[PDB]
Design a protein around this ligand. Structure first.
Ligand SMILES: [Cl-]
Ligand SMILES: [Cl-]
Ligand SMILES: [Cl-]
Ligand code: NA
Ligand code: NA
Lengths: 341, 345
């Protein structure tokens, strides 16, 4: 790359010699490294030795929230914030009230709609506006959140399985909840994947394999990991069971793999709004400096060959949560649409 | 820089060998160049040969807007596009005469005056703005590529305060301030209010000459630079308007030259500044041509106030904070601002 190397050192020299402020070579190369890695996609980046030490503590694909909780007291106030935590260092304190999360007012939202904004993949970012501070604050979802499928039997005999994240036991837990509620009365199963940031790819593949006897569930394009293709397997465990999937703009990664597999094999009717559009596998690359690189090494592809990253999954029938409609009413109306198939 | 060069080539190798997509050396170094130059500040960047050819067409510090106009002609609060010429950049993007613009930089035009709309539409030439049309569900990025000719807009208020609206500092601004103040001087004139709201700047020299009209001594502005050297512009003797009381009105869009003028008049206690903190833009940029035909736009100097305060990133705090209250009529705000100026010793 002699022609490119020559252009780079020429520019480096002009920057070092004419920028208003004299910068160190260590600072200039660090700016060059950030552009080299972050210029690949919106998820690849350089990690400082500390950002790396912090990221190794978390398991990849865990559901997480902030290092505190919000509770309504006549106003969503901060509570359980531990002294010395990253949020404490940024200025947050127990008692302060949060008015917005990612420009969305918490007035009129339920405890669930607030968790919907607070929850996300571990390591992810969110902004908060406090009534005290006059400016927004960037926080990191660094607190792992344990979850189980949340089942609800609707009056119309539709079993709703709320999956906030795919975990090692998700597939076995879907099997158990459907069977424990299965009978001549069960009409259909509605899988609520709204606000599901993903979780384990293997769990989404196993979950889809419960309802598919053949065909590719998902394919991966990778140079360092190789081009894999996960195929479904025979087993009429769930053949006569009608299935629906509910997604929102926060449904992502593994949740999109599962949704796409079920939709493109026409096994489930997908309702809601277009998914987030995140279909990447990242790997951490330690450096001698102690720092590291977080980089995309694989892209997920749907059975029809569609790239999930940047596109997202379009539902079979668009029906987002209408403005200020009550949650349990939206669930019932979504269940009604599924029964009319 | 052996330790940092070794780290850079190691990272380059990891990217080239493991990124999901095989990328060319030309593309990897280009991403490294963009991070190296854009990583300096929010105004420095690499320009492709085309981005450079486009930038040289515009004159530095000219006031500009989009290649069309907005006027409500359908409904009273729906701003429709008019004067859009076929073949223009906006026409190629999908905009058409008749379409309605609901937002500019996420701000609804619904309840705004013709002035508040120009406030969002106007800006330094080459600048960017986003627009949401009623016909589209997604935003559109436009460039202020149409220069806007201007003159000082004078208004004599009933309280005998002369308001001089300066949308941008130009070569004739100083002479025009002198002429408008003199042709309106009399035993009745109480004070002069310089309205610099939404003024993106213009020529530094024009702001310095404008401040020199009201100052007999002291530094108007200083420049800190390695490639240009540390210069400092001083005021000169000549009591042009010794007995003239002066006020300055600024908003969050008042910037660069407008901030230099405002800071000079404020820190020498020559004018009472009201409104809200200025934008905070005090940089001098230089273009660095490259053999590829491309170039680098980079900050080479910072402007400093008389007290030695840096304008870039700080902005100028007014003497008395008084932003346009919610839904207050413009003429009323101007009268209240003029009243505050008259209540000064
Ligand atoms: Cl080579
Ligand atoms: Cl060195
Ligand atoms: Cl020119
Ligand atoms: Na199967
Ligand atoms: Na003078």
């Amino acid at each position: 790359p002699i022609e490119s190397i020559q252009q780079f050192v020429q520019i480096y020299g002009i920057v070092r010699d004419n920028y208003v402020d004299e910068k160190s070579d260590d600072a200039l190369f660090l700016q060059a490294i950030k552009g080299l890695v972050s210029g690949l996609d919106r998820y690849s980046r350089y990690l400082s030795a500390e950002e790396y030490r912090q990221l190794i503590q978390y398991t990849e694909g865990d559901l997480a929230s902030v290092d505190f909780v919000l509770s309504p007291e006549s106003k969503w106030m901060i509570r359980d914030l531990k002294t010395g935590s990253d949020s404490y260092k940024l200025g947050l304190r127990n008692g302060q009230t949060i008015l917005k999360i990612d420009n969305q007012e918490l007035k009129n939202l339920t405890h669930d709609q607030v968790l919907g904004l607070l929850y996300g993949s571990i390591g992810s970012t969110l902004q908060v506006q406090t009534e005290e501070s006059n400016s927004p604050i960037s926080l990191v979802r660094n607190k792992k959140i344990e979850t189980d499928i949340e089942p609800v039997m609707l009056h119309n005999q539709v079993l709703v399985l709320k999956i906030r994240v795919f975990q090692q036991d998700t597939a076995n837990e879907i099997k158990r909840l459907i069977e424990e509620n299965s009978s001549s009365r069960l009409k259909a199963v509605l899988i609520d994947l709204r606000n599901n940031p993903g979780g384990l790819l293997s769990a989404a593949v196993e979950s889809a394999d419960l309802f598919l006897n053949h065909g590719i569930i998902v394919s991966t394009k990778s140079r360092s990991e190789g081009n894999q293709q996960f195929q479904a397997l025979p087993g009429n465990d769930f053949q006569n069971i009608k299935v629906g999937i509910l997604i929102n703009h926060r449904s992502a990664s593994a949740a999109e793999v599962f949704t796409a597999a079920m939709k493109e094999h026409q096994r489930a009717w997908v309702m809601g709004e277009k998914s987030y559009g995140k279909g990447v596998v990242q790997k951490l690359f330690p450096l001698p400096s102690g720092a590291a690189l977080q980089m995309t090494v694989s892209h997920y592809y749907t059975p029809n060959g569609n790239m999930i990253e940047g596109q997202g999954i379009q539902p079979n029938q668009t029906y987002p949560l209408p403005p200020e409609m009550k949650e349990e009413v939206y669930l019932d109306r979504v269940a009604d649409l599924l029964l009319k198939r």
